[PDB]
Amino acid sequence: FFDDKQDFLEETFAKYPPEGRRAAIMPLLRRVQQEEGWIRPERIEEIARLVGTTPTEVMGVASFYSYYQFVPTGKYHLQVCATLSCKLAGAEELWDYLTETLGIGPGEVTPDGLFSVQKVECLGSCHTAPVIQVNDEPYVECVTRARLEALLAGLRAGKRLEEIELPGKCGHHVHEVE
Amino acid sequence: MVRVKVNDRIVEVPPGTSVMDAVFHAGYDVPLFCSEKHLSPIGACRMCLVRIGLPIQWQPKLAASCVTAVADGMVVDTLSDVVREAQAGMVEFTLLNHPLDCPTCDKGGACELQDRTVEYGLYEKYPLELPVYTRFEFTRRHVDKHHPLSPFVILDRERCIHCKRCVRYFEEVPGDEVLDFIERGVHTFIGTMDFGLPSGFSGNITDICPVGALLDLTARFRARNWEMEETPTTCALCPV
Amino acid sequence: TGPILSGLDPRFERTLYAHVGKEGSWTLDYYLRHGGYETAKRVLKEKTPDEVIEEVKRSGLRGRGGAGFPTGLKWSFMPKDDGKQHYLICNADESEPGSFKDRYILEDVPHLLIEGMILAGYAIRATVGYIYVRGEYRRAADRLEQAIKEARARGYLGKNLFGTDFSFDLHVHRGAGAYICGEETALMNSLEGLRANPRLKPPFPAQSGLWGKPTTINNVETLASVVPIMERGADWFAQMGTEQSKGMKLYQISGPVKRPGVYELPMGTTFRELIYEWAGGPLEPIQAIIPGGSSTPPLPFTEEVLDTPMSYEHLQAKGSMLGTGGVILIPERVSMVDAMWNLTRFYAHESCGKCTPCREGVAGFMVNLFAKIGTGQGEEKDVENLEALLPLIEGRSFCPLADAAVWPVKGSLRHFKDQYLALAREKRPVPRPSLWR
Amino acid sequence: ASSERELYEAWVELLSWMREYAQAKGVRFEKEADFPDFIYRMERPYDLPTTIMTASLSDGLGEPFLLADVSPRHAKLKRIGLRLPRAHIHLHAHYEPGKGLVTGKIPLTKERFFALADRAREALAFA
Numbered sequence: 001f002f003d004d005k006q007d008f009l010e011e012t013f014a015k016y017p018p019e020g021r022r023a024a025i026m027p028l029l030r031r032v033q034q035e036e037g038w039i040r041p042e043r044i045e046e047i048a049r050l051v052g053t054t055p056t057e058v059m060g061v062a063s064f065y066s067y068y069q070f071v072p073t074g075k076y077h078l079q080v081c082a083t084l085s086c087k088l089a090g091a092e093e094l095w096d097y098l099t100e101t102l103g104i105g106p107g108e109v110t111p112d113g114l115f116s117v118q119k120v121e122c123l124g125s126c127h128t129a130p131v132i133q134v135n136d137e138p139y140v141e142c143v144t145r146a147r148l149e150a151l152l153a154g155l156r157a158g159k160r161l162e163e164i165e166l167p168g169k170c171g172h173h174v175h176e177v178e
Numbered sequence: 179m180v181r182v183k184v185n186d187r188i189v190e191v192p193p194g195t196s197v198m199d200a201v202f203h204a205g206y207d208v209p210l211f212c213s214e215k216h217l218s219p220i221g222a223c224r225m226c227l228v229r230i231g232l233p234i235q236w237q238p239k240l241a242a243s244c245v246t247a248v249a250d251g252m253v254v255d256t257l258s259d260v261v262r263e264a265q266a267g268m269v270e271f272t273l274l275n276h277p278l279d280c281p282t283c284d285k286g287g288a289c290e291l292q293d294r295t296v297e298y299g300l301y302e303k304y305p306l307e308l309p310v311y312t313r314f315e316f317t318r319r320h321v322d323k324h325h326p327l328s329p330f331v332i333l334d335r336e337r338c339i340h341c342k343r344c345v346r347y348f349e350e351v352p353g354d355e356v357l358d359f360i361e362r363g364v365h366t367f368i369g370t371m372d373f374g375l376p377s378g379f380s381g382n383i384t385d386i387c388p389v390g391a392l393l394d395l396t397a398r399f400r401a402r403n404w405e406m407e408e409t410p411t412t413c414a415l416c417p418v
Numbered sequence: 419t420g421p422i423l424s425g426l427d428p429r430f431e432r433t434l435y436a437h438v439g440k441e442g443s444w445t446l447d448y449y450l451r452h453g454g455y456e457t458a459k460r461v462l463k464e465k466t467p468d469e470v471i472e473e474v475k476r477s478g479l480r481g482r483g484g485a486g487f488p489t490g491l492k493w494s495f496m497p498k499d500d501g502k503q504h505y506l507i508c509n510a511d512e513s514e515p516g517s518f519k520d521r522y523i524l525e526d527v528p529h530l531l532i533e534g535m536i537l538a539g540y541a542i543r544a545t546v547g548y549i550y551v552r553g554e555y556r557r558a559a560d561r562l563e564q565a566i567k568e569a570r571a572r573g574y575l576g577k578n579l580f581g582t583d584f585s586f587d588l589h590v591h592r593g594a595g596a597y598i599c600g601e602e603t604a605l606m607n608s609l610e611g612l613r614a615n616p617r618l619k620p621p622f623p624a625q626s627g628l629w630g631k632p633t634t635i636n637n638v639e640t641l642a643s644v645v646p647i648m649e650r651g652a653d654w655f656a657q658m659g660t661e662q663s664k665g666m667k668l669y670q671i672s673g674p675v676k677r678p679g680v681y682e683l684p685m686g687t688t689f690r691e692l693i694y695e696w697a698g699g700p701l702e703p704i705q706a707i708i709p710g711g712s713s714t715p716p717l718p719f720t721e722e723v724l725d726t727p728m729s730y731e732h733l734q735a736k737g738s739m740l741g742t743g744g745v746i747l748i749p750e751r752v753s754m755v756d757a758m759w760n761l762t763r764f765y766a767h768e769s770c771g772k773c774t775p776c777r778e779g780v781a782g783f784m785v786n787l788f789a790k791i792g793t794g795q796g797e798e799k800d801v802e803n804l805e806a807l808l809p810l811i812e813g814r815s816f817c818p819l820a821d822a823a824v825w826p827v828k829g830s831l832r833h834f835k836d837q838y839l840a841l842a843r844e845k846r847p848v849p850r851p852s853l854w855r
Numbered sequence: 856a857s858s859e860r861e862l863y864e865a866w867v868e869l870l871s872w873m874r875e876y877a878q879a880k881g882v883r884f885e886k887e888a889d890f891p892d893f894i895y896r897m898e899r900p901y902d903l904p905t906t907i908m909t910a911s912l913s914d915g916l917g918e919p920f921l922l923a924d925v926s927p928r929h930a931k932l933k934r935i936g937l938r939l940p941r942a943h944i945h946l947h948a949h950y951e952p953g954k955g956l957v958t959g960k961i962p963l964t965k966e967r968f969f970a971l972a973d974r975a976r977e978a979l980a981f982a
C-alpha cells in the first residue's frame with residue numbers, strides 16, 4: 001500500500017525522531033483508513049514493518065480507537081453523535097429513524113452499497129446539535145429531519161457534499177434558535 | 179536507611195523500596211494482581227491500596243503501595259476498616275466478569291484470584307444478617323475461550339482480569355512484543371498478530387498469569403494443582 | 419465604576435475571538451494587518467525565558483484545560499536548563515461535551531495560538547513543538563497545517579527567529595477519536611505510537627515527557643491567552659475576574675436556550691446574565707445546569723444559583739466546579755435519570771481499561787444500574803446500591819476518568835434521589851418525548 | 856414476561872443459522888461455553904431447550920471473527936449479543952412478539968445475519 005508513496009513515509013517519519021518512528025503508526029493508519037475505507041491485516045503488517053515494531057503492537061494500537069474501521073464500510077459512513085446535548089436535541093429519535101429506514105446495523109452496510117451507520121460520542125459542536133460526520137468531512141450540523149433527508153437524497157444521487165444545498169442556517173460559533 | 183511504620187511495627191528499609199515491599203517486610207499482607215517480581219510495577223489492579231501518613235497527617239486518598247515510593251519516617255496502614263472494605267470492593271470488581279470455571283479450571287488450588295478473594299473479600303459489615311455474595315446480577319463478559327495460541331499455550335480471554343503481567347513481561351524481559359490487548363473499555367482482550375508465539379520464553383506467562391487465562395497446553399487436563407507431587411530439581415539440558 | 423471586571427462593563431477588550439468568524443481570518447496577511455507577531459517579535463529579543471515565565475506567573479494565568487494549574491509555577495518546574503531538547507505540546511483534543519471553544523480558534527485564528535506557543539517554547543527552552551489534534555476536527559487541522567506552512571514560508575518558524583539565538587518549529591499530529599487521549603500522559607503514548615494508557619506520574623512530564631524529554635503541555639486557550647498578556651500588559655489581563663479566577667474565559671452554552679454558542683467573557687459573569695442577556699434566555703423550564711464541562715456536578719435552577727458567579731471558588735463553595743465553562747442546561751422535560759444514563763454510558767465507552775475498578779465497575783456495573791432504573795426495571799435496592807457504589811470508584815484510580823464519571827452521578831443523586839427512587843418504585847422507563855424536528 | 860421461552864427458541868434458531876453458514880462456507884464453528892446453571896445444577900431442574908451459552912466462528916487460524924452470546928437463565932435485562940472481534944462492533948438483539956428477532960427496531964433476518972457473517976469472514980479472517 002505504502003510502496004507507492006515513499007515520499008509520504010519520509011515526510012511523516014521526518015516529523016518524528018529517528019528512534020520514535022513508531023509515532024508514524026497514527027498517520028499511516030489514518031492514510032490507509034481514509035483511502036481504502038477500512039484497515040486490513042496486511043496494512044497493519046506493512047505499517048509494522050515500515051515503522052519498526054510488531055504487527056501485534058500495531059494491531060493493538062489500531063484497535064484502540066473508534067475511528068479505525070476493520071470491516072468494509074459504505075461510501076458514506078454516517079457517524080451520528082449521540083452524547084447528552086445531541087440527545088437533548090433528539091439524537092435518540094434521529095438514530096432510531098435512520099437505522100430503521102436504512103435497515104442496517106452498525107456493523108453492516110446498505111445493499112445500495114453506499115450507506116453504513118455508526119454511533120459516535122461528542123463531536124465537539126454542541127450548540128448546533130444534533131451532529132453527524134461523513135467519513136472525513138466537517139460536520140453536517142443543525143441536523144433537522146429535512147436537512148438529514150436532503151443530505152441523504154443528495155448523496156443518493158452522487159452530489160458531492162461540499163456542494164449540496166442544505167436547507168436552514170447553521171451558526172458559526174453562535175446560532176439563533178426560533 | 180528509611181524509617182517506616184506498618185500498623186504496629188517499625189522497619190528499616192532501603193530508600194528505593196516500594197511501600198508494598200515495606201509492608202511485607204514488616205510482615206503484613208495486601209492484595210497483589212498487577213505487579214510481579216522483576217517486572218515494572220504499574221497500578222492496574224489497584225489491589226495494593228494502603229493508607230499513608232507523612233507528618234498525624236493522613237493522605238486524602240489511598241496510596242497504591244506497589245507504585246508508591248517510601249519516604250523517611252512514613253506510616254502505612256493496611257488494617258483500617260476502610261482499607262479492608264476497599265480491598266473487598268476491588269476484589270468484587272475483579273470477579274465481576276469471571277467465567278465461573280473454578281471446578282473445571284486448570285488453575286485449581288493455586289489461583290491468586292481465588293486466594294486473595296478468600297483472604298480479603300467479604301468484609302464484615304455491621305446479628306445473623308443474611309449476606310449476599312454477588313450484587314452484580316447482569317450478564318458477564320463472554321469472549322473467545324480455550325484458544326490455542328501456540329502448540330504450548332492456551333488462552334482463555336474470559337479469565338483474564340486485564341492486569342498487565344504478560345504484555346509487560348513480553349515487552350521487558352524477553353523483548354518480544356507478541357502479545358497485547360486489542361480493544362478497550364471492558365472489550366479489552368489479549369491477542370496477537372504474531373500467532374506462532376515466536377519467543378523462546380513464551381511459557382513463563384503461564385506461571386505469571388494470576389488466573390487461568392494463559393495455561394500450559396502440554397499439561398492441560400492432567401491433574402489439579404494440589405494433587406501433583408512436586409520434585410524440586412535442576413534442569414540438565416544446558417549448562418546454565 | 420470601582421475597578422473590577424465582572425461582566426458587561428464597557429472597558430473590556432475582545433482579544434482572542436475578535437478575528438473569529440471574519441472571512442480570511444486565517445491569512446497571515448490578515449493577522450499582520452491587525453498587528454500579529456508584534457508581541458512575539460518584541461518578547462523574543464527583549465525578555466528572557468525567566469522573564470516571560472515570571473510575566474505569566476504575575477498574570478496568574480491558570481490552566482485552561484480544565485485543571486487550573488498556574489502555568490507560571492508550572493513552567494517554574496521545568497529544568498529550565500539541562501542541555502536536553504524540550505518539546506512544547508499543544509492539546510487540541512477537544513473531546514468533552516458542551517465544550518466547543520477551541521474548535522473555532524483553530525479554524526479561524528491559528529496564528530494567535532502559534533504566537534502563544536512561540537512564547538511558551540521560548541519560556542521553557544523548547545525548540546520543537548507538537549500540536550496533537552483530535553481526528554474529528556478536519557477543517558481546523560487543514561487551517562492549522564496551512565497556517566504553519568505560511569509561517570514556515572514567510573519565516574515565522576525557522577532555524578533562528580528574528581535574529582535571536584532561539585529556534586522553534588511545530589508539527590501537527592492528528593488523533594483518532596479517543597477521549598482518554600486527552601489526558602496529558604495518555605496523549606504522549608498515543609503520539610509516540612503506543613496505546614493511549616496513562617503513564618506512572620511519580621516520574622513527572624516536566625522532567626520526563628515525550629521520548630523522555632522535559633516536555634510541557636498547555637491548553638490551546640492558555641497558549642492563545644499568552645499573546646494578549648505579553649502584548650498589552652499582564653495587569654491588563656489580571657484586570658478581569660475574582661481574586662482567585664484572573665483573566666477572561668471563553669464560555670460556551672448549549673441546550674434549550676434561545677441562542678447557544680461561544681462568548682468571550684470575563685470571569686465571574688452570573689448564570690442569569692449568561693443564559694438571559696447572551697444566550698437569549700431558555701426555551702423551556704430548566705431543572706438543572708451543568709456549569710463547567712460534562713464532568714461537573716449539576717446544580718438546580720435556583721435564584722441563589724443563577725446569582726452565583728461562575729468562578730473557581732464560588733462554584734467550589736457551591737459543590738460544583740468550573741472546568742471548561744461549557745454550560746449545559748437540563749430541562750424538566752428530560753429525566754435526570756436519563757441524563758446521567760447517557761453520561762455514564764459515554765464514560766464507559768471511553769474508558770481505556772487499565773484499572774479494573776474503572777473498566778469493570780463503570781462499563782458493566784454503573785451503566786447497568788442506570789439501565790435497570792430508567793428502563794422501568796429499577797428498584798429502591800438498585801438506587802441504594804448505586805448510591806453506595808460511587809465511593810469505591812471515586813477515591814482511587816490511575817487516572818481521574820473514574821472521578822469524572824462518578825461526580826456528575828454523585829451530584830445528580832444528591833439533588834434528585836427523589837427522581838431515582840420514583841422511577842424505581844413505579845417501574846417506569848424514562849420519559850421519551852419527541853425532542854427533534 | 857413469557858418472552859424468555861421464544862427468546863431461547865430463537866437463540867437455538869440463530870445457533871442453527873451459524874452451524875449452517877459454517878458448513879456451507881467451510882469455516883470453523885465452535886461451541887465455546889455451556890450454562891453454569893446446567894453444569895452445577897445437581898438435582899435442580901433445567902427447562903431450557905439447550906444448555907449452550909456461547910458460540911463462535913473462527914477462521915482457519917482459530918482466531919474468531921464472529922462471536923454470539925445469550926444471557927443466563929437467571930440474569931437481569933436478558934438479551935442476545937453479537938460481536939466482531941478486532942472490529943469494535945457490537946449488536947444487541949431482542950425479541951418482539953409477532954415481528955420476530957429484532958436488533959433494536961430492525962428485524963434480524965437470517966439473510967441479514969448471513970451477510971454480516973460473510974463480510975466479517977472476508978474482512979477479519981486471517982486464513
Ligand SMILES: Cc1cc2nc3c(=O)[nH]c(=O)nc-3n(C[C@H](O)[C@H](O)[C@H](O)COP(=O)(O)O)c2cc1C
Pocket residue numbers: 480481482483484485486487489509511512513514597598599600601602635636637638640817818819
Ligand atoms: C481523562 C481526562 C481527559 C482529558 N481530556 C482533555 C481534553 O480532551 N482536552 C483538554 O484540553 N484537556 C483534557 N484533560 C485535562 C488536561 O489535564 C489538560 O488539558 C491539561 O492539564 C492542560 O493543562 P493547562 O490547562 O494548564 O494548559 C483531560 C483530563 C483527564 C483526566
Ligand code: SF4
Pocket residue numbers: 276277278279280281283284285286289290291292337388389390391
Ligand atoms: S481463574 Fe481462579 S477464580 Fe477463575 S475459574 Fe479459575 S480457579 Fe476459579
Ligand code: SF4
Pocket residue numbers: 337338339340341342343344345368386387388389391392
Ligand atoms: S492474560 Fe493473565 S497475565 Fe495477561 S493481562 Fe490477563 S490476567 Fe494478566
Ligand code: SF4
Pocket residue numbers: 598615616768769770771772773774776777815816817818819820
Ligand atoms: S481510570 Fe479508566 S481510563 Fe483511566 S487509566 Fe484507569 S482504566 Fe484507563
Ligand code: FES
Pocket residue numbers: 081082083084085086121122123124125126129130131515516517
Ligand atoms: S454532544 Fe454531540 S456535539 Fe457535543
Ligand code: FES
Pocket residue numbers: 209210211212213219220221222223224225226227242243244245
Ligand atoms: S498491586 Fe499495586 S496496583 Fe496492582
